[PDB]
Amino acid sequence: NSFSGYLKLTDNVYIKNADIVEEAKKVKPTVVVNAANVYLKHGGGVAGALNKATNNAMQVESDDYIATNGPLKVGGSCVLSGHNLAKHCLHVVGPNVNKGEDIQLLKSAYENFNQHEVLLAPLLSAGIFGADPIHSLRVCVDTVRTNVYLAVFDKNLYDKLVSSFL
């Protein structure tokens, strides 16, 4: 968990302008969080980038999990292997607000982080799911109580988050 170059926002939330895949390769954290969907189909965004970096081993494992357990609920999670990127991957489903899913489920999504002492994570629901990224960071800060290191792969968005926060 050798995180470097983060800015501490609160007692337990840190943030960096970085690709989460590059962070995972350098740090080999105990847990990396995936911004997943309910069927664990890693087609784009953070999910597609993490899966590509495992050479599709994450997708093969996810398909087997879904066959045996069924889909996750919105706001839910499962713990699977982190493959070459981390000890574990915590797959978390935030609401797709562009498709009418309730934004209050973003609090339930972030609550899953509290089962792990230290996590490398992305900003939930901030991609194609359509939540305001600054609102997602506010819910993270007011929900997560364990130590989370947020990687945001966009310098313009990073600067807007840090200006709004501090």
Ligand SMILES: CC(C)[C@H](Nc1ncnc2[nH]ccc12)C1=[SH]CCC1
């Ligand atoms: C908001 C956006 C810049 C961010 N993308 C990323 N954040 C961190 N590492 C990344 N690697 C590849 C994409 C990527 C997302 S997509 C879904 C949730 C958060």
